[PDB]
Amino acid sequence: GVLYVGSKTKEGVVHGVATVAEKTKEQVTNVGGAVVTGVTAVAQKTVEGAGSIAAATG
Amino acid sequence: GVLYVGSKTKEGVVHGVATVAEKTKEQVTNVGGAVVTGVTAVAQKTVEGAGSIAAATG
Amino acid sequence: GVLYVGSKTKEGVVHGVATVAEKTKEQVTNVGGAVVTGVTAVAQKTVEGAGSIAAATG
Amino acid sequence: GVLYVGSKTKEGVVHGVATVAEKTKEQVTNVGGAVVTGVTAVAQKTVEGAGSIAAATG
Amino acid sequence: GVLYVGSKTKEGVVHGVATVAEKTKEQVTNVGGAVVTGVTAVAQKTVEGAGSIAAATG
Amino acid sequence: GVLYVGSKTKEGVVHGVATVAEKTKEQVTNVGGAVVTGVTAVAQKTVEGAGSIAAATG
Amino acid sequence: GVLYVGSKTKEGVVHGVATVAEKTKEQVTNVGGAVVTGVTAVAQKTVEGAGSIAAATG
Amino acid sequence: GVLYVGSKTKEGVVHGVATVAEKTKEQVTNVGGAVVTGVTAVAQKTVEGAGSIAAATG
Amino acid sequence: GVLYVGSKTKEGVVHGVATVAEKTKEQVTNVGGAVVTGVTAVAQKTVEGAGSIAAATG
Amino acid sequence: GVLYVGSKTKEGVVHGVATVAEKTKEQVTNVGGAVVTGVTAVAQKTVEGAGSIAAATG
Numbered sequence: 001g002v003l004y005v006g007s008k009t010k011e012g013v014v015h016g017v018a019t020v021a022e023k024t025k026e027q028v029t030n031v032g033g034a035v036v037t038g039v040t041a042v043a044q045k046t047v048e049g050a051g052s053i054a055a056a057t058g
Numbered sequence: 059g060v061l062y063v064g065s066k067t068k069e070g071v072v073h074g075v076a077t078v079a080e081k082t083k084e085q086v087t088n089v090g091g092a093v094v095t096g097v098t099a100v101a102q103k104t105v106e107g108a109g110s111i112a113a114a115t116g
Numbered sequence: 117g118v119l120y121v122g123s124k125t126k127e128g129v130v131h132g133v134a135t136v137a138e139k140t141k142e143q144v145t146n147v148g149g150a151v152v153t154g155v156t157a158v159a160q161k162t163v164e165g166a167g168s169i170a171a172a173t174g
Numbered sequence: 175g176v177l178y179v180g181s182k183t184k185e186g187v188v189h190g191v192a193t194v195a196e197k198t199k200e201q202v203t204n205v206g207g208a209v210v211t212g213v214t215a216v217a218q219k220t221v222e223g224a225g226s227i228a229a230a231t232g
Numbered sequence: 233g234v235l236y237v238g239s240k241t242k243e244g245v246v247h248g249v250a251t252v253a254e255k256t257k258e259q260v261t262n263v264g265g266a267v268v269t270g271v272t273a274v275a276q277k278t279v280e281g282a283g284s285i286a287a288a289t290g
Numbered sequence: 291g292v293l294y295v296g297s298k299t300k301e302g303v304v305h306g307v308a309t310v311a312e313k314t315k316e317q318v319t320n321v322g323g324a325v326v327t328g329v330t331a332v333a334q335k336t337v338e339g340a341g342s343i344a345a346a347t348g
Numbered sequence: 349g350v351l352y353v354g355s356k357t358k359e360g361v362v363h364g365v366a367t368v369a370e371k372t373k374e375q376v377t378n379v380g381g382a383v384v385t386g387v388t389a390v391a392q393k394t395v396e397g398a399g400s401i402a403a404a405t406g
Numbered sequence: 407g408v409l410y411v412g413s414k415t416k417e418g419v420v421h422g423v424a425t426v427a428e429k430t431k432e433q434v435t436n437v438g439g440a441v442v443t444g445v446t447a448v449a450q451k452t453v454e455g456a457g458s459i460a461a462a463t464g
Numbered sequence: 465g466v467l468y469v470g471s472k473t474k475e476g477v478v479h480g481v482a483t484v485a486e487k488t489k490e491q492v493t494n495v496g497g498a499v500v501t502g503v504t505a506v507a508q509k510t511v512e513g514a515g516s517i518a519a520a521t522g
Numbered sequence: 523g524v525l526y527v528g529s530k531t532k533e534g535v536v537h538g539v540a541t542v543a544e545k546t547k548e549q550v551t552n553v554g555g556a557v558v559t560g561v562t563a564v565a566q567k568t569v570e571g572a573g574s575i576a577a578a579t580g
Contacts, residue, residue, distance in 0.1 A: 004062045004236045007098040007272075009155075011069045011243045016095045016269070018076045018250045019085055027085045027251055027259045032111070032283045033092045034104070034265045037074070037248045038273035040065075040239040041096035041154070043104060046266070046275060049282040050107040050165070051090045053264070056114045057289045061119045065156040067213075068126045074153045076134045077143055085143045090169070091150045092162070095132070096273070097241075098123075099154035099212070101162060107282070108165040108223070109148045115173045119177045123214040126184045132211045134192045135201055143201045148227070149208045150220070153190070156181075157212035159220060166223040167206045173231045294352045297388075301359045306385070308366045317367055317375045322399045324381045327364045328389035328447070329415075330355040336382070336391060339398040339456070343380070347405045351409045355446075358416045364443070366424045375425055375433045380457045382439045385422045386447035386505070387473075388413040394440070394449060397456040397514070401438070405463045409467045413504075417475045422501070424482045433483055433491045438515045440497045443480045444505035444563070445531075446471040452498070452507060455514040455572070459496070463521045468526045471562075475533045480559070482540045491541055491549045496573045498555045501538045502563035504529040510556070510565060513572040517554070521579045 005042060012039040030055055063100060070097040088113055121158060128155040146171055179216060186213040204229055237274060244271040262287055295332060302329040320345055353390060360387040378403055411448060418445040436461055469506060476503040494519055527564060534561040552577055 016037035021027055032053035034046035074095035079085055090111035092104035132153035137143055148169035150162035190211035195201055206227035208220035248269035253259055264285035266278035306327035311317055322343035324336035364385035369375055380401035382394035422443035427433055438459035440452035480501035485491055496517035498510035538559035543549055554575035556568035 002060045002234045005098065005100060005238060006063060007065045007239045007241065009065065009067045009070055009097045009241045012097045012241055013071045013245045014096055015073045015247045016249055017074055017093060019087060020078045020252045021082065021085050021256055022080045022254045024079055024082045024085055024253065024256045027253050027256055028287050029087045029251060029261045030285055030287050031089045031263045031265060032285045033089060034275060034278045035093045035249060035267045036273055036275050037095045037269045038246055039097045039241045039244045039271045040237065041094055041099045041273045042237060043092060043094050043101045043275045046092045046104045046278045047283060048106045048280045051105060051109045051283045053088055053090045053111045053285045055086050055088050055287045056112060058116045059117045063121045063158060064123065066124045067128055067155045070128045070155045072130045072154055074132045075151060077145060078136045079140065079143050080138045082137055082140045082143055087145045089147045091147060093151045095153045097155045099152055099157045101150060101152050101159045104150045104162045106164045109163060109167045111146055111148045111169045113144050113146050113171045117175045120179065121216060122180045124182045125186055125213045127186065128213045129187045130212055131189045133190055133209060135203060136194045137198065137201050138196045140195055140198045140201055145203045147205045149205060151209045153211045155213045157210055157215045159208060159210050159217045162208045162220045164222045167221060167225045169204055169206045169227045171202050171204050171229045292350045295354060297355045297357065299357045302357055303361045305363045306365055310368045311372055312370045314369065314372045317369050317372055318403050319367060319377045320401055320403050321379045321381060322401045324391060324394045325365060325383045326389055326391050327385045328362055329357045329360045329387045330353065331389045332353060333391045336394045337399060338396045341399045343401045345403045349407045353410065354412045356414045360415055360417065361419045363421045364423055368426045369430055370428045372427065372430045375427050375430055376461050377425060377435045378459055378461050379437045379439060380459045382449060382452045383423060383441045384447055384449050385443045386420055387415045387418045387445045388411065389447045390411060391449045394452045395457060396454045399457045401459045403461045407465045411469045413471045413473065415473045418473055419477045421479045422481055426484045427488055428486045430485065430488045433485050433488055434519050435483060435493045436517055436519050437495045437497060438517045440507060440510045441481060441499045442505055442507050443501045444478055445473045445476045445503045446469065447505045448469060449507045452510045453515060454512045457515045459517045461519045466524045470528045472530045476531055477535045479537045480539055484542045485546055486544045488543065488546045491543050491546055492577050493541060493551045494575055494577050495553045495555060496575045498565060498568045499539060499557045500563055500565050501559045502536055503531045503534045503561045504527065505563045506527060507565045510568045511573060512570045515573045517575045519577045
């Protein structure tokens with residue numbers, strides 16, 4: 001249907017997905033899907049498919 | 059149907075998904091789905107599919 | 117149906133999903149679904165599918 | 175049906191899902207579903223599917 | 233259907249997906265899907281297919 | 291001597307010398323001296339001289 | 349001597365010397381001296397001389 | 407002597423000397439001295455001389 | 465002597481000496497002295513001389 | 523002596539001496555002295571002489 005956005009934003013800061021580490025053997029980031037970041041952000045029908053992720057360690 | 063947003067926001071700061079660590083053997087982040095971050099943020103029908111994630115350690 | 121949002125927000129700060137650690141063998145974050153973060157935030161029909169996540173350690 | 179929001183909020187701060195630790199062998203966070211965080215936040219029909227998560231340790 | 237965006241944003245800063253590390257044996261970032269970052273950002277029908285990613289270590 | 295001020299004030303509003311009228315033949319304001327207005331305000335040795343004012347009507 | 353000011357003020361508004369009128373034959377404002385207005389305001393030795401003002405009507 | 411100012415002010419608004427009128431035969435403003443207006447404002451030795459003003463009507 | 469100013473101000477607005485009128489036979493503004501306006505403002509030894517002003521109507 | 527200014531100001535607006543009118547037979551502005559306007563503003567020894575102004579109407 002109808003989607004509307006009115007965003008009158010000022011002095012916007014945005015951080016999305018971050019990691020900070022020190023003396024760490026691994027850093028893993030996984031996204032099976034969609035990341036949207038922004039001051040003003042819209043997202044629809046992003047994951048029509050199977051969003052499935054594995055981080056398996058043996 | 060109809061979706062409307064009126065956002066008059068000022069002095070916005072946003073952080074989404076963060077991690078902080080020190081002397082950690084691992085950092086894992088998993089997203090099987092959709093991340094939206096923002097000052098003003100909309101999301102619909104993001105995960106039409108199976109959002110399933112495994113972080114298995116052996 | 118009809119969804120409306122009127123947000124007149126000022127001096128907004130937002131943090132979503134964070135972790136802080138020190139001398140930790142692991143940090144795991146899992147999302148099988150959808151994360152929305154923001155000053156003003158809308159989300160609908162995010163998880164149409166099976167949002168199921170496993171963090172199994174052996 | 176009809177959903178309306180009128181939010182005139184000022185000096186908003188929001189934290190969602192956080193963890194703090196020191197000298198902890200693990201940190202696990204699991205979300206099988208949807209997280210919405212924000213100053214003003216709406217969410218509907220988020221989990222149409224089975225939101226089921228396991229954190230099993232052996 | 234109809235998607236509209238009105239974004240009158242000023243003094244926008246955006247960071248998307250970042251990692252910071254020190255003396256870490258690995259940094260892995262995985263995206264099986266679509267990343268959109270921006271001041272103003274729209275995304276639809278991004279992942280029509282199966283967004284599935286594996287980060288398996290043996 | 292020594293004058294110190296420590297003012298940690300938040301959400302300050304200040305009005306000084308105001309007048310409001312309706313259908314008044316005159317409005318007179320007189321200051322022979324010094325007006326200081328402010329959130330945080332200091333004043334010393336303002337009127338070293340003769341602060342003398344006349345509003346005489348004949 | 350020593351004058352110090354520490355002002356950590358936030359969300360400051362200041363009005364000094366104002367007048368409001370409707371259907372008034374005169375508005376007179378007189379300052380023989382010094383006006384200081386501000387969020388943070390200091391004033392010293394302003395009126396070393398004779399601050400004397402007359403608003404005489406005949 | 408020593409004058410110091412530490413002003414850490416945010417979201418400052420300042421108005422000094424204003425007048426508002428409607429259907430008024432006169433508006434007079436007089437300053438014989440010094441006006442300082444500002445967010446942060448300092449003033450010293452402004453009026454070393456005779457600050458004397460007359461608004462006489464006959 | 466020593467004058468110091470530390471002003472860390474953000475989002476500053478300043479108005480000094482204003483007048484507003486409607487259907488007024490006169491507007492007079494007089495300054496015999498010195499006007500300083502600003503976000504951050506300093507003024508010293510402004511009026512070493514005789515600051516004396518007359519607005520006389522006959 | 524020593525005058526120092528440290529001004530770290532952001533988003534500064536400044537108006538000094540303004541007048542607004544409608545259907546007014548006169549507008550007079552007089553300055554016998556010195557006007558300084560600015561975001562950051564300093565002024566010293568401005569009026570060493572006699573700052574004296576007359577606005578006389580007959």
